[PDB]
Amino acid sequence: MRAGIRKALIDNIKELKGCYEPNVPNKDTKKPYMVVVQGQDNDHGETIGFERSIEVWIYEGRTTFKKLDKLTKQVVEVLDMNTIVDESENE
Amino acid sequence: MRAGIRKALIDNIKELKGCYEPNVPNKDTKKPYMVVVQGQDNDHGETIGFERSIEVWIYEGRTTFKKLDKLTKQVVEVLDMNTIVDESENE
Amino acid sequence: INIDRRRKDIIRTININPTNITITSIKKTEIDGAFEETETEIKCVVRIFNEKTAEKQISSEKQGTFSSIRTYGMLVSNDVILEVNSRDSLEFECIYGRMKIVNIYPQIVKGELCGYQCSLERID
Amino acid sequence: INIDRRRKDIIRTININPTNITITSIKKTEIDGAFEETETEIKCVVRIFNEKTAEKQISSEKQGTFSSIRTYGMLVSNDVILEVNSRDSLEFECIYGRMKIVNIYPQIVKGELCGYQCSLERID
Amino acid sequence: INIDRRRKDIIRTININPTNITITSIKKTEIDGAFEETETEIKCVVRIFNEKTAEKQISSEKQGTFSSIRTYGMLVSNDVILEVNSRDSLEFECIYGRMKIVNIYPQIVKGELCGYQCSLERID
Amino acid sequence: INIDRRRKDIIRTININPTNITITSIKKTEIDGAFEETETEIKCVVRIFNEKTAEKQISSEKQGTFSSIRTYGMLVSNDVILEVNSRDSLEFECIYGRMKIVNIYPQIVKGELCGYQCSLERID
Amino acid sequence: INIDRRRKDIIRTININPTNITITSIKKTEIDGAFEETETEIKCVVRIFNEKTAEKQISSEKQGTFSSIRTYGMLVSNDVILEVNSRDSLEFECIYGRMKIVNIYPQIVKGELCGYQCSLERID
Amino acid sequence: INIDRRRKDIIRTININPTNITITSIKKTEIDGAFEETETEIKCVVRIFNEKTAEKQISSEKQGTFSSIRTYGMLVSNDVILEVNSRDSLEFECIYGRMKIVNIYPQIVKGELCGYQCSLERID
Numbered sequence: 001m002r003a004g005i006r007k008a009l010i011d012n013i014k015e016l017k018g019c020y021e022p023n024v025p026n027k028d029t030k031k032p033y034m035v036v037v038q039g040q041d042n043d044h045g046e047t048i049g050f051e052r053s054i055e056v057w058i059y060e061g062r063t064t065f066k067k068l069d070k071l072t073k074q075v076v077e078v079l080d081m082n083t084i085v086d087e088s089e090n091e
Numbered sequence: 092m093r094a095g096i097r098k099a100l101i102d103n104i105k106e107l108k109g110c111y112e113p114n115v116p117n118k119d120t121k122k123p124y125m126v127v128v129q130g131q132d133n134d135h136g137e138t139i140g141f142e143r144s145i146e147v148w149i150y151e152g153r154t155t156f157k158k159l160d161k162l163t164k165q166v167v168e169v170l171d172m173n174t175i176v177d178e179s180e181n182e
Numbered sequence: 183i184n185i186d187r188r189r190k191d192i193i194r195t196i197n198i199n200p201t202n203i204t205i206t207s208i209k210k211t212e213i214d215g216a217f218e219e220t221e222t223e224i225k226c227v228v229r230i231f232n233e234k235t236a237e238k239q240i241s242s243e244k245q246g247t248f249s250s251i252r253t254y255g256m257l258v259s260n261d262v263i264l265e266v267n268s269r270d271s272l273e274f275e276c277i278y279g280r281m282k283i284v285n286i287y288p289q290i291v292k293g294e295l296c297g298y299q300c301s302l303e304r305i306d
Numbered sequence: 307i308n309i310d311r312r313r314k315d316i317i318r319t320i321n322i323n324p325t326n327i328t329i330t331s332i333k334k335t336e337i338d339g340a341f342e343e344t345e346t347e348i349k350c351v352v353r354i355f356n357e358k359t360a361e362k363q364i365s366s367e368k369q370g371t372f373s374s375i376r377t378y379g380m381l382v383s384n385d386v387i388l389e390v391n392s393r394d395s396l397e398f399e400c401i402y403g404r405m406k407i408v409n410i411y412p413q414i415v416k417g418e419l420c421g422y423q424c425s426l427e428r429i430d
Numbered sequence: 431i432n433i434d435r436r437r438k439d440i441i442r443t444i445n446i447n448p449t450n451i452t453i454t455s456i457k458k459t460e461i462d463g464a465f466e467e468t469e470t471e472i473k474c475v476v477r478i479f480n481e482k483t484a485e486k487q488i489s490s491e492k493q494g495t496f497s498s499i500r501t502y503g504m505l506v507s508n509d510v511i512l513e514v515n516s517r518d519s520l521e522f523e524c525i526y527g528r529m530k531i532v533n534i535y536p537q538i539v540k541g542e543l544c545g546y547q548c549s550l551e552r553i554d
Numbered sequence: 555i556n557i558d559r560r561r562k563d564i565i566r567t568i569n570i571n572p573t574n575i576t577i578t579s580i581k582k583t584e585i586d587g588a589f590e591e592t593e594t595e596i597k598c599v600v601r602i603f604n605e606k607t608a609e610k611q612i613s614s615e616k617q618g619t620f621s622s623i624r625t626y627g628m629l630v631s632n633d634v635i636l637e638v639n640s641r642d643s644l645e646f647e648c649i650y651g652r653m654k655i656v657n658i659y660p661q662i663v664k665g666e667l668c669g670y671q672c673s674l675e676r677i678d
Numbered sequence: 679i680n681i682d683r684r685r686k687d688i689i690r691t692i693n694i695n696p697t698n699i700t701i702t703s704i705k706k707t708e709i710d711g712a713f714e715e716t717e718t719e720i721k722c723v724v725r726i727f728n729e730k731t732a733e734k735q736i737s738s739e740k741q742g743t744f745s746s747i748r749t750y751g752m753l754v755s756n757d758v759i760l761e762v763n764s765r766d767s768l769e770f771e772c773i774y775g776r777m778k779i780v781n782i783y784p785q786i787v788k789g790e791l792c793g794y795q796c797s798l799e800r801i802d
Numbered sequence: 803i804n805i806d807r808r809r810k811d812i813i814r815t816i817n818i819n820p821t822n823i824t825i826t827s828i829k830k831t832e833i834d835g836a837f838e839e840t841e842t843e844i845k846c847v848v849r850i851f852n853e854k855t856a857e858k859q860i861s862s863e864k865q866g867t868f869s870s871i872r873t874y875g876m877l878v879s880n881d882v883i884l885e886v887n888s889r890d891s892l893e894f895e896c897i898y899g900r901m902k903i904v905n906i907y908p909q910i911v912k913g914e915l916c917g918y919q920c921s922l923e924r925i926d
Contacts, residue, residue: 020587027372064340111339118248155216267554678887
């Protein structure tokens, strides 16, 4: 699911410079960049089944937090309840 | 929402010297100054929707706590339930 | 060692490379279980020198950010009595960042003061 | 010590093994309780030397990974006024990883600047 | 080394730069599983000197604030028997913050006491 | 110092006690926000020497166990350009546990490379 | 070095400033998965000296309070075999607080014992 | 330096104060994702010496108690090949507590082994 979320974030956001994995980006990576971190998978009952938790950690150049708030609203708009296709898994 | 709260605190309080973001103010910043820190956004049910938590950290020159208590009462008076307009977001 | 020897040496060493310094003292006074601060400004001739090869610490947090280094010392004559405690502070505006007097070493000969060896913290 | 002696020594030592360096300065300016960064680029002649036998730290985490070492010093003349603070930074691209000026030691004689002793951090 | 040599050296060294000191001793005595403190005051001739290039610690908390430094030593003759334990303390009022005797080094020659090398802590 | 002097000294010192070494370099390349590792193998003549009196650390955990020591240095000529970063590694197979190049010190004279002083970590 | 040289030197050095000491040894013996302690008392001639410039630690807690310092060494002849382990202890009553033998260094020449260099901890 | 010089020096130094030592090696072998330990016993002539002024650590817990110190080094000839890793251990029982070989420094001249400098840990 990393590939799908990364592709969606890159395609639908243009302020973004890159969407990496947890410990990938070097100190010279160009901000703002995002990091997709997968969490637990927990059995949340019969109706939901196993529920994965995924975090999207946005980063910014320490200019001001308003830019990061705008980026956060953009990410929420992109990923919230929109069906995403992971081309690697084809799922 | 940082801009709206900062503007309200600066406008409606005169003892205040400045209202900054978390790690901004240098050591030579003139006290008293406030810092606006945003917290979680949690889904608190259908009726409330997502509920953001915001903190306003007052600072003072270590003269006495009575000045800080007065400033705290002023901040509570300014921000408690009064509609504030964020000019940057226009929301 | 004689007092005049120490006095001559301190005055000479300060005079090799003196700088006029505007010490500002904020002394906290206990009033009703709280502090009332009285600010005074005092000037002295001073020489500043390196004493410790120390790394610059940084202390960023939600209160704010500041970086301080402990390298510089200080050496001042007997002209003014100094004191630094928890309740008393001394700073001065060196153009290369704020300087703060951390600790005072009073050079005494036979129970008579002659000058303060001193340490600093350059706050940026 | 006379100012000309210090100037000659600094210039000679830099000229034994100089390197042309492109310092880039990012100065944070407080605007509406946040920082607006103005980037300027300044060039100086510089000699780089080892000062401390230190070990390379690594700081891998979910934000990213980078390793830095504090071994390299630096020595530059009076040609440009440098400054480093919490809100001010200076970096330059040595071909073996980007360097970063951590702390500045301004060599001063009789209240007159003559050159900066300096310390670096080679950010890999 | 002869006892007279050590005695002469200690007395001479104290007499180069002596200071009259009013040691106050608070000795805790176990009474019903608690301490009953008996306060006594004793005077001695003493020379104070730097021994360690230490850094002033600060310990502010809701109980209160105090800063202490470990730099100063002490050197006193045989005239009075001293002792410092967990249950026993020794302090005195130097002008620049009251001192406190941390640890005692008794200089002994052939099982005979001749003077205490001693260490201090200047509590501001 | 002239470049030829440094070159002769480095080559001589390596030739007093050289060892042929098979450096293996794994360079991480950013591809789709992840690393694609390209493995290359390069050979050089090298002298290995003690530099630090360190102690062998051990890092046993549920991932596994390995013990590493920081004592050994390294000294290699100009024949091959080296580089170690967070994303780049260099190792080689010494008989007594695998060595790993932690940090590189490039010896430069007048902006010209002549040899790498280097540090190792003997991973057992 | 010959054994007689070492023996003469140890005996001389102890005899410059000897102190008669009453070592008390508590040896823990494993009995039914617990310790049964047998207390024996042995006497030796000993010279005590400073070895480390250390600072007095304090360990106050709800169990009790005690302060200890590691400054004092010790030097004893071959007359009695010593041993200190986790299960074996050695203490003695110096006038200025209890002494405790932390670690033993057996001075051996050609596989033959001649005397123990030793370290102490003055438990106040 | 010639190999014969190093060999003569090592053998002489060991022969000034040699001790016959019964090294026991427990080598862990990976079998079905677990360790199968094969115990071998090998003897060598050895000289033991102090290298570091360290303090005896103690590690008491519900598993048990043991105290170890890192002071002793070791120096052994070329007669037997040694190796210590995470999966490989070497121990021997000096009468004053069990000794354990922590780290091995192989003294090599021109890619040829001549003797192991070594460090120990006296486990009480």
